[PDB]
Amino acid sequence: QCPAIHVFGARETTVSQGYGSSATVVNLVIQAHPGTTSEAIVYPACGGQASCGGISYANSVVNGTNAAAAAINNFHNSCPDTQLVLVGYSQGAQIFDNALCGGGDPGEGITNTAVPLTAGAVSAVKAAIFMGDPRNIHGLPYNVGTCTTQGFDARPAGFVCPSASKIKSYCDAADPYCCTGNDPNVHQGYGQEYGQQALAFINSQLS
Numbered sequence: 059q060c061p062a063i064h065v066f067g068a069r070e071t072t073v074s075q076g077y078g079s080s081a082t083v084v085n086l087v088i089q090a091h092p093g094t095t096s097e098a099i100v101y102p103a104c105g106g107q108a109s110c111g112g113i114s115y116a117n118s119v120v121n122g123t124n125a126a127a128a129a130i131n132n133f134h135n136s137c138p139d140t141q142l143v144l145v146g147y148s149q150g151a152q153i154f155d156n157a158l159c160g161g162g163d164p165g166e167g168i169t170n171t172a173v174p175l176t177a178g179a180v181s182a183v184k185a186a187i188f189m190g191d192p193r194n195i196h197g198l199p200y201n202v203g204t205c206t207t208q209g210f211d212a213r214p215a216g217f218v219c220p221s222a223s224k225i226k227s228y229c230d231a232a233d234p235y236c237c238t239g240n241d242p243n244v245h246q247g248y249g250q251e252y253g254q255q256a257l258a259f260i261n262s263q264l265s
């Protein structure tokens with residue numbers, strides 16, 4: 059039978075195939091709700107490193123965005139009544155951002171602005187947690203964190219995501235990727251810093 063809730067997790071760059079740091083929030087939802095299953099998005103999660111196949115960041119985001127859209131759409135078709143939750147970390151947050159909000163990603167070669175998710179899939183997605191999203195920019199209504207600048211693939215100032223009310227994007231000032239910081243460690247600690255807050259949001263979003 060189909061699960062009551064299903065969580066999609068996308069990892070950060072250079073991490074081997076799996077959930078990566080998205081695991082923290084994914085596990086919190088699974089443990090807190092009976093009938094919750096999950097799956098990790100299968101994509102390169104690379105930035106030119108030989109460790110992850112040598113696939114460039116742009117090609118990783120291009121593949122990832124499509125992989126994310128295909129996984130969510132396909133699962134919804136199999137289980138249309140299941141509540142969906144997305145958890146992306148770093149590059150993982152970027153592919154979910156592109157797939158859910160659309161608006162294109164020019165810095166990575168994506169010009170299409172249409173949301174790749176089906177109407178049914180979009181309505182099934184109840185909550186989305188982004189941590190260290192390189193598409194971050196200060197001012198977005200779903201932002202949480204001390205960052206007051208932007209990431210390397212910053213969204214337009216005043217960007218309007220159709221599903222803005224279903225998202226929580228965490229990003230602090232010292233993050234060098236989702237912000238203009240210089241401390242890489244801050245980028246890796248969102249699961250511990252905002253994990254419980256994320257869960258609380260997901261709980262309020264779920265029916």
Ligand SMILES: *[C@@H]1O[C@H](CO)[C@@H](O)[C@H](O)[C@H]1NC(C)=O
Nearest residue numbers: 100101102103121122124125
């Ligand atoms: C995306 O990358 C994965 C491996 O990470 C691969 O299995 C898949 O075939 C790629 N998808 C496309 C559309 O190229």
